[PDB]
Design a protein around this ligand. Structure first.
Ligand SMILES: Nc1ncnc2c1ncn2[C@@H]1O[C@H](COP(=O)(O)OP(=O)(O)O)[C@@H](O)[C@H]1O
Ligand SMILES: Nc1ncnc2c1ncn2[C@@H]1O[C@H](COP(=O)(O)OP(=O)(O)O)[C@@H](O)[C@H]1O
Ligand SMILES: Nc1ncnc2c1ncn2[C@@H]1O[C@H](COP(=O)(O)OP(=O)(O)O)[C@@H](O)[C@H]1O
Ligand SMILES: [Mg+2]
Ligand SMILES: [Mg+2]
Ligand SMILES: [Mg+2]
Lengths: 520, 546, 536, 48, 191
């Protein structure tokens, strides 16, 4: 006579909120030192055994299973921030924790209702987007020299700041290739390929506009160096396709069995003759290839590569402009790809690699990263994802804002001036939003090794004079303006941070009871 | 309660036997045990809850419809309130939290009447005469839907359904969204009767900017991915034709139990060709019709994708049945299960194709959605909700889905009444004077029925963490003068309720909160029919499983 | 519950409860389970029952108290019936079996009235008014026997003695047990025929012999032999003397020593020889004291050593050892002697007097049991009951004990009533007559008690094998035809429902005690609503 | 189901009164057969 | 752990003085006051010390009732001896009562003839040793074949008193624990 198979007992009242807010503080503590240029690294032991060395916020949270359900709302914010932008994931977690940490002693102390706080955060969020729009400014998007320092901003936290001169050119040429004209920048990360090659040196690299395949030719007579290749994409297998009808043959005469295998040879003969109707030089197929079909293609020099993935065939199509056609009858000269060149197979003892290069504005490329271990290849690969993620927003919108705690301090100073001017019941939680933006500058200072009490005290008086571009240096900890150094980020990262931080606080502040035992 | 009773003393039953007022008390505690989780979720001051499935997965929910459905209760007296929450979600779509609290208090307040040796048959009769007297009073106190020169109604109706949600602060922005959505997806049936199909609009689980910047689509949005990446994503120009197919387009075998058998091996390749050719003849005539966009319920094989990529046709696989009826209804096309006609020949006519102005595929946080806008024959609408994660959007999805049902009822029935416990407090003053007229034992039943109705405005103040008796006493004072209004408007002291954000009694018409009267009607009958089901039980017979 | 452990009383899950109508059905059926045991036992045609104790010993009894006493029960309702039979057994000693079937008869008739919806207090008040009304009527109709002389008063004890012996085994030799039971009270009685002392007559059984060998002897039973059996077994008195001059002593034959621990120090050989002289002179002075006192038989409480055997044998003085203090209380009252503490206070006036002392074997090797007999009437009678089995002689003890208790009730003046089912039916028809004008709400309450009293005649009809309806119809019609109310159910088959003819008599105090304990317990059981019982 | 238990309660006390069960059984069949004839006189006919 | 407990537990009031120089005063004097109080309780309980030769009437007077003692459940063990001068083991057991009485003054030692003990007792079953405590019989012991018979010694009798709960195991008066001074002298030299 329990009346409930799912937590007949209840944890209600204020104790559930202590468990919620304290859990929201704990997820921020394990990544508090993961901000700024002097940030440390972390290691995670997954149960499968694949280790990873990460400092980005999204990779930390997704590989950590958490038993607390209220904490999991904080775990998913970096997932939301990752798929939306792909940069600034760590700031969303600590900012959401400071909002929840600062709003903690109001239900305990003041006994102010949560729904009044919900109204306070929306007006603060409305004013937060207003002052961020005032602090932001436009810049020229076509200046390649200007784009290098903006990509260098997010790279400065990561390990590859030492190769920032190479990484900016590596990412700037790649994002411009997939870019096209038509939200005015409809290019997508899915078209950009990044193949991880263990070994080599990271200094030696280049942006090759092509599709890097990880297999060898099927027959040894084929020439591995073609001057003017002609790409033709196919979905049909060169093998004999088995019918799904399960056809059985009643053989009575003696010549029927010999004629069937001759029709098998005649079908592959007629099928290969239609490939040579447009005389290609390079053929690609996503299915198997019989040994019978290899001989007939030697006379034409049609290099074949088999078991190619479905996504790689689409990437081959956009580079060379070839159309994917299943049947072999519909091959035309327009179907054959053109404007391709520099087909060469470099011999490496691990695996065989084949390059491609060009001479329907959609394009693609393959960034070949060289390193020392597979785990740091994932680090540099994730930095490439962060390298192009910061570049999309400056190309999408020309708007741009400073960073390094200066833009967050400008929100706190403007809110603090109007917080005393409001003079109402909602002004108490309205002040918590102004105090919540101080964690980021503080975090940066603390990691740098400075004394945050006096560095931030003069920073308050500095911003009171009427300037906004004054930040905090990460190495030595000056109050120097960021115009000299060049720390600048897009506006979309800070907009998504304050929006996701406010929207996450509204989700978690309106919880009073915790239950379990449902087993859906 | 105290101890367990004797197990089948000279009765010889395999299960348990219990009788008397003990099980009647257990039903009261059973209805109160399941109602306590619904107490804190009532009104705008209520807070949400989360249910953990012991697998890491959790879901945030405010309404008691799906909360009690997820809470697996084994006591059968509590199952009726579980089904009552599911019943009220189907017909009305709002007030699932209120019927559980009202039904529990009617049983709780009637528990005192049981030990007074008042029979339950007399108690429910006193409740039922109070019910039909309350329905007529609700039919008298209802107001018209004009109220001014302009409409000024549907924006206020959304605030009542949108209250007590995570996006209640953003209800000012979403109020214009829901009224513009349901006015676009209207239809015509029964020779002049207008209907509003709930769930016809597409609620997408998007992630990004915020709930405030949620863009209302002027048209339907299909949630599906493109087949191939080499296809054109954006199709401009007016009069874009929409083809809605459902037949099997991938290469399939012969009839369900036949066997292909042939003696001559010369025609073995020809039968293979025509099986590959007969499926392409269907794609050939669609290109002759010139359909820019084609949608299919079943899959799409690569043999068909080459023709769409060449002719620049947008082929989309993995559509669902319920969606394509709304695409054909909105774009003006007709659902095509197979290509045939009354004649023996097989062909395709251009009349089967729809029309729309623009079709664009958009991607936002790993969510590809085909935005179809500008339907010529009939309009459509979709709402792209944006938030933190999928589990937070489930509360927003239920918040929007309940909002459509409330705005559906105020248009189907223009009669409305104010919120804030106005009618719940007005019926008490009406029933107290009626309780004295009837005389005999039903006075206590009608009186305690009226006392149970006050729990709705009381719970608004208890959850607000404020003084409740002062607000109830002031609400009692104004409603007490309404019956003694002395007509000759100057009929004041009516249509008032609680204002929780400020803690005062003001006019609900000016505050901008209303609710349809039909929700009050069905909630009272369904709450009393559930109360009749629990009161009439005397003894339980629980048989153990074999 | 609200999830927390909702516990109030210690050991919550062990104990249970029971309320409503189901609590009552557990009570009435529990009484019917005990009533079926007693219903087939009551009356002269009853049957005994074997009660096996945990220690393996058995007792063949057909008395309700001894049955219920040795019965291991769990239900509390039967445990109150165990004490009700024990209550009737301790004070009156008659009707134990009745107070169970009669209380169950009130409970069985109360079950039908609970179905009608009568409150239990109105049921209990109805039996209280009906019980006093029946006692007030039966006190008027019974006749007094004090006007008759002593010769006829002895016959009234024989009427009740044969009534009490019968229905028990010991119903063969019952004509002699009636004379033996009456002869025991003729010796032990007050001159005013009032407040006789029952403690003077103790029960004593002997395993052996047959029932015919039992006889009357006025004396004490000791389970021991004389000291050093070389003397003759049967000692006789002198030629001219008042008696054997019995002597009793609570001092062992030894030198006088302090009661406190002592240390007699002998520091010289001359003092050591005086200790030898002191040792011998005390035994010499001791036997000279009892010699000059004229005692023949000596009774010692705390025994003595072997030195006094030869001194007592030469002077022709039998003696015993290890006589318990309870037996000396019985010896002094029987022989009318005073127990001297020591030899210095020894005088001829304190010695008792009895006829003769002798011992027999009763068989081969069992034990030598001492026998004493008086030559005249004394204030002590010890029944000498024999038996072929240990269960026979054990049942004969409690059977004869109830016989003396029934005669003890008749010692009280003006308490006689003719039983045999006549007392039940004569109290039943008047209660139904009162209900006809005292209807009220309690009209069915009087009818229940009227029908409950008649069950004991119907119980006698079942054991005798006669038709119950024809029996009660004839008795009820005969009581309405004639106001003579001494006709009852005769089951022993001598013909004649009349009864004074059949020499049967019950005590009046015993019969009114039946409905009192039955009604007083029924008032208690009907008050119970909640039944809380804990696990063992 | 209530009249059956009531007649069994009537037969409960009658078993103690030295009456055979078959005589008790036949008495109810004769009494029930007479009960039908009494109600046939009391019941009133109605129209179609 | 036991090394700290052996300083106080394994030393009497006479042996605790040896640790006056090594151990702390407050640590040592705190336990000496405890052991001194225990010694005072045994002196108050020493209401006996010689064989109580009783008569049969007194058998209740001094045995069963005495075993109740204070009835603080101040029980007292009462060893009764059904003596018989003819048997060999009886005079042996009588000597053990005299020796044990001088040592264990809190335990009451009682003796009585077997002929004056039980009505016609079997002489073959003599000597008999009964142990009363709070009115209840703790041990009804049979002739001394269990305790060696004719070769019974004082060490075997003291071991029996420990089994019935009359004397503690680690009592300094028992010969098993009361090591000779020459034994402890050799241990200190070879240490
Ligand atoms: N050398 C530096 N001096 C000042 N500020 C820095 C420096 N390096 C990084 N920052 C600040 O730290 C932030 C780190 O951003 P990033 O590492 O891309 O994501 P996250 O903020 O989630 O760690 C930047 O927004 C930038 O303003
Ligand atoms: N702004 C408001 N002011 C006063 N009362 C309100 C307000 N919004 C809702 N209510 C009250 O809350 C009650 C139930 O609200 P409802 O929207 O059904 O909650 P839920 O969406 O959780 O079911 C209504 O009866 C109404 O009177
Ligand atoms: N010889 C007899 N003749 C007629 N009736 C007898 C005889 N002996 C006993 N009775 C009746 O039997 C009834 C039950 O007596 P019984 O049960 O034997 O005594 P108790 O209840 O003391 O054991 C009494 O009411 C008594 O009148
Ligand atoms: Mg970053
Ligand atoms: Mg609602
Ligand atoms: Mg009798």
């Amino acid at each position: 006579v329990v009346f409930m198979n799912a937590s007949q007992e209840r944890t209600t009242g204020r104790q559930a909120q202590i468990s919620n807010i304290t859990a929201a503080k704990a997820v921020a503590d394990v990544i508090r030192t993961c901000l700024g240029p002097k940030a440390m690294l972390k290691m995670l032991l997954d149960p499968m055994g694949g280790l990873v060395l990460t400092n980005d916020g999204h990779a930390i949270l997704r590989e950590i299973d958490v038993a607390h359900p209220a904490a999991k709302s904080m775990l998913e914010l970096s997932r939301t921030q990752d798929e939306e932008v792909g940069d600034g994931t760590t700031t969303v977690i600590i900012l959401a924790g400071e909002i929840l940490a600062q709003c903690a002693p109001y239900l305990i102390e003041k006994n102010i209702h949560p729904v009044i706080i919900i109204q306070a955060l929306k007006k603060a969020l409305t004013d937060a987007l207003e002052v961020i729009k005032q602090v932001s400014k436009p810049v020229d998007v076509e200046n390649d020299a200007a784009m290098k320092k903006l990509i260098q901003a997010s790279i400065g936290t990561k390990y590859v700041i030492h190769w920032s001169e190479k990484m900016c050119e590596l990412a700037l040429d790649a994002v411009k290739t997939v870019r096209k004209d038509l939200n005015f920048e409809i290019d997508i990360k899915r078209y950009v390929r990044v193949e991880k090659i263990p070994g080599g040196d990271v200094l030696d690299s280049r942006v090759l506009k092509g599709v890097l395949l990880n297999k060898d030719v099927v027959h040894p007579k084929m020439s591995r160096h073609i001057e003017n290749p002609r790409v033709v994409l196919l979905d049909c297998p060169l093998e004999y396709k088995k019918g799904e009808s399960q056809t059985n043959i009643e053989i009575e005469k003696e010549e029927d069995w010999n004629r069937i295998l001759q029709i098998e040879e005649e079908q592959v003969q007629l099928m290969c003759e239609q490939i040579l109707a447009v005389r290609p030089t390079l053929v690609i197929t996503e299915k198997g290839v019989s040994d019978l079909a290899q001989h007939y293609l030697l006379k034409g020099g049609c290099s074949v590569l088999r078991r190619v993935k479905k996504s790689d065939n689409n990437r081959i199509a956009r580079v060379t402009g070839a159309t994917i056609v299943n049947r072999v009858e519909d091959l035309k000269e327009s179907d054959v790809g053109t404007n391709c060149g520099l087909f060469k197979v470099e011999m490496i003892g691990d695996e065989y690699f084949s390059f491609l290069d060009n001479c329907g504005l959609q394009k693609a490329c393959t960034i070949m990263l060289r390193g020392g271990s597979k785990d740091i290849l994932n680090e540099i690969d994730r930095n490439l994802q962060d390298a192009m993620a910061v570049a999309r927003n400056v190309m999408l919108s020309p708007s741009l804002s400073p960073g390094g705690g200066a833009t967050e301090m400008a929100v706190s100073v403007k809110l603090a001036e109007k917080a005393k001017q409001l003079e109402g019941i909602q002004q108490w939680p309205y002040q918590a939003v102004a105090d919540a933006m101080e964690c980021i500058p503080r975090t940066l200072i603390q990691n740098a090794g400075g004394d945050p009490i006096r560095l931030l005290s003069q920073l308050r008086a500095k911003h009171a004079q009427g300037n906004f571009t004054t930040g905090i240096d990460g190495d030595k900890g000056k109050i120097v303006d960021m115009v000299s150094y060049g720390i600048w980020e897009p506006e979309v990262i800070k907009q998504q941070s304050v929006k996701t931080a406010i929207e996450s606080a509204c989700l978690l502040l309106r919880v009073d009871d915790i239950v379990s035992g449902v087993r859906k | 309660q105290l101890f367990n009773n004797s197990r089948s003393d000279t009765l010889f039953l395999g299960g348990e036997k219990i009788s008397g007022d003990d099980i009647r008390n257990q039903n009261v505690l059973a209805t109160m045990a399941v109602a306590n989780v619904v107490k804190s979720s009532l009104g705008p001051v209520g807070l949400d809850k989360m249910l953990v499935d012991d697998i890491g997965d959790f879901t945030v929910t405010n309404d008691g419809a799906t909360i009690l459905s997820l809470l697996d209760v084994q006591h059968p007296a509590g199952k009726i309130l579980v089904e009552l929450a599911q019943q009220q979600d189907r017909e009305i779509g709002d007030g699932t939290t209120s019927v559980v609290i009202i039904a529990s208090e009617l049983l709780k307040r009637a528990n005192e009447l049981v030990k007074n040796k008042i029979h339950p048959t007399t108690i429910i009769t006193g409740f039922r005469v109070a019910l039909r007297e309350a329905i007529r009073f609700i039919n008298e106190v209802l107001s018209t839907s004009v109220d001014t020169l302009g409409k000024e109604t549907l924006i206020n109706i959304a605030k009542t359904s949108m209250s007590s949600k995570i996006i209640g602060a953003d209800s000012d922005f979403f109020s214009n969204m829901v009224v513009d959505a349901l006015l676009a997806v209207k239809t015509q049936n029964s020779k002049g009767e207008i209907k509003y199909p709930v769930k016809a609009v597409n609620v997408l689980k998007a992630h990004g900017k915020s709930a405030t910047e949620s863009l209302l689509v002027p048209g339907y949005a299909l949630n599906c991915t493109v087949a191939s990446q080499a296809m054109p994503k954006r199709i401009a120009g007016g009069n874009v034709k929409i083809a809605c197919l459902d037949l099997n387009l991938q290469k399939a075998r012969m009839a369900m139990g036949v066997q292909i058998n042939i003696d001559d091996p010369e025609q073995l390749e020809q039968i293979r060709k025509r099986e590959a050719g007969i499926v392409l003849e269907r794609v050939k005539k669609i290109i002759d019709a010139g359909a820019q966009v084609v949608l299919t319920t079943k899959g799409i094989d690569d043999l068909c994708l080459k023709e769409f990529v060449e002719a620049k046709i947008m082929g989309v696989r993995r559509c669902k049945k319920e969606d394509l009826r709304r695409i054909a209804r909105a774009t003006g096309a007709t659902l095509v299960s197979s290509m045939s006609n009354l004649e023996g020949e097989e062909t395709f006519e251009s009349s089967y194709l729809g029309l729309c102005d623009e079709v664009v595929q958009a991607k936002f946080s790993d969510d590809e959605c085909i935005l179809i806008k500008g339907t010529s024959k009939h309009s459509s609408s979709s709402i792209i909700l944006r938030g933190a994660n999928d589990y937070s959007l489930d509360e927003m999805e239920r918040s929007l889905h309940d909002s459509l049902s409330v705005v559906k009822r105020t248009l189907e029935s223009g009669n409305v009444v104010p919120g804030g416990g106005c009618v719940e407090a007005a019926l008490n003053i009406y029933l107290d004077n009626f309780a004295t007229t009837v005389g005999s034992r039903e006075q206590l039943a009608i009186a305690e029925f009226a006392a149970a109705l006050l729990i709705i405005p009381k719970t608004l103040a208890v959850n607000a963490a404020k003084d409740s008796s002062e607000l109830v006493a002031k609400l009692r004072s104004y409603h007490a003068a309404s019956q003694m209004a002395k007509p000759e408007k100057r009929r004041s002291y009516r249509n008032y309720g609680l204002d929780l954000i400020r803690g005062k009694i003001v006019d609900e018409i000016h505050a901008g909160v209303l609710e349809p009267t039909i929700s009050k009607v069905k909630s009272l009958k369904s709450a009393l029919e559930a109360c009749v089901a629990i009161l009439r039980i005397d003894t339980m017979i629980t048989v153990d499983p074999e | 519950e609200m999830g927390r452990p909702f516990i109030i009383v210690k050991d919550q899950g062990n104990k249970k409860r029971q309320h409503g109508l189901e609590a009552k059905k557990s009570h009435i059926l529990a009484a019917r389970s005990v009533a079926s045991i007693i219903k087939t036992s009551l009356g002269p045609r009853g049957l005994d029952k074997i009660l096996i104790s945990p220690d393996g010993e058995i007792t063949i009894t057909n008395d309700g108290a001894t049955i219920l006493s040795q019965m291991e029960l769990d239900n509390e309702i039967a445990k109150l019936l165990v004490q009700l039979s024990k209550s009737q057994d301790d004070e009156i000693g008659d009707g134990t079996t009745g107070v169970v079937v009669l209380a169950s008869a009130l409970l069985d008739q109360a079950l039908e009235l609970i179905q009608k919806g009568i409150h239990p207090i109105k049921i209990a008040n109805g039996f209280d008014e009906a019980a006093k009304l029946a006692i007030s009527k039966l006190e008027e109709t019974c006749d007094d026997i004090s006007a008759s002389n002593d010769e006829l008063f002895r016959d009234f004890l024989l009427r009740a003695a044969k009534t009490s012996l019968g229905s028990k085994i010991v119903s063969k030799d019952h004509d002699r047990f009636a004379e033996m039971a009456v002869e025991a009270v003729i010796n032990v009685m007050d001159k005013d025929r009032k407040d006789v002392d029952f403690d003077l007559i103790k029960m004593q059984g002997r395993v052996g012999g047959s029932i015919s060998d039992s006889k009357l002897i006025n004396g004490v039973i000791l389970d021991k032999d004389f000291s050093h059996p070389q003397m003759p077994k049967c000692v006789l008195p002198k030629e001219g003397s008042d008696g054997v001059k019995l002597a009793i002593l609570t001092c062992p034959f030894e030198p006088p020593k302090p009661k406190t621990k002592h240390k007699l120090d002998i520091s010289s050989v001359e003092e050591y020889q005086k200790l030898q002289t002191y040792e011998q002179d005390k035994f010499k002075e001791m036997i000279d004291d009892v010699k000059k006192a004229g005692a023949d038989v000596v009774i010692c409480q705390w025994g003595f050593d072997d030195e006094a055997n030869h001194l007592l044998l030469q002077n022709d003085l039998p003696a015993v050892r290890w006589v318990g203090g309870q037996e000396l209380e019985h010896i002094a009252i029987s022989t009318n002697g005073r127990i001297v503490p020591r030899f210095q206070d020894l005088s001829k006036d304190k010695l008792g007097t009895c006829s003769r002392i002798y011992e027999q074997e009763f068989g081969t090797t069992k034990d030598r049991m001492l026998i004493i007999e008086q030559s005249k009437e004394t204030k002590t009678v010890t029944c000498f009951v024999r038996g072929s089995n240990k269960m026979i002689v054990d049942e004969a003890e409690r059977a004869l004990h109830d016989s003396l208790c029934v005669v003890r009730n008749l010692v009280k003046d003006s308490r006689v009533v003719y039983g045999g089912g006549a007392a039940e039916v004569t109290m039943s028809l008047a209660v139904s007559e009162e209900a006809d004008k005292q209807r009220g709400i309690d009209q069915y309450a009087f009818r229940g008690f009227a029908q409950a009293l008649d069950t004991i005649p119907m119980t006698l009809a079942e054991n005798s094998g006669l038709d119950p309806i024809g029996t009660l119809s004839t008795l009820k019609s005969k009581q309405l035809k004639e106001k003579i109310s001494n006709i009852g159910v005769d089951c022993l088959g001598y013909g004649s429902n009349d009864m004074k003819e059949l020499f049967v008599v019950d005590p009046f105090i015993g019969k009114k005690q039946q409905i009192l304990l039955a009604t007083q317990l029924c008032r208690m059981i009907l008050k119970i609503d909640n039944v809380i019982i804990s696990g063992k | 189901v209530i009249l059956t238990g009531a007649l069994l309660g009537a037969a409960e006390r009658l078993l103690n009164k030295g009456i055979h069960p078959t005589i008790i059984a036949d008495s109810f069949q004769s009494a029930a057969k007479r009960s039908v004839d009494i109600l046939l006189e009391m019941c009133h006919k109605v129209s179609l | 752990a036991k090394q700290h407990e052996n300083r106080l537990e394994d030393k009497d009031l006479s042996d605790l003085e040896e640790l006056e120089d090594d151990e702390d005063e407050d640590f040592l004097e705190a336990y000496k006051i405890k052991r001194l109080n225990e010694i005072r309780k045994l002196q108050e309980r020493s209401k006996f010390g010689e064989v109580f030769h009783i008569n049969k009437p007194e058998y209740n007077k001094e045995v069963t009732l005495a075993s109740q003692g204070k009835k603080d459940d101040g029980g007292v063990y009462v060893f009764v001896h059904l003596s018989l001068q003819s048997k060999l083991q009886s005079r042996i057991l009588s000597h053990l009562f005299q020796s044990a009485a001088c040592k264990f003054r809190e335990i009451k030692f009682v003796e009585i003839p077997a002929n004056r003990a039980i009505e016609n007792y079997p002489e073959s079953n003599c000597p008999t040793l009964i142990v009363y405590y709070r009115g209840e019989v703790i041990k009804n012991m049979i002739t001394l074949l269990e305790l060696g018979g004719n070769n019974s010694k004082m060490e075997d009798f003291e071991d029996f008193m420990v089994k019935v709960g009359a004397v503690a195991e680690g009592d300094n008066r028992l010969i098993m624990n009361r090591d000779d001074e020459e034994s402890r002298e050799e241990r200190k030299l070879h240490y």
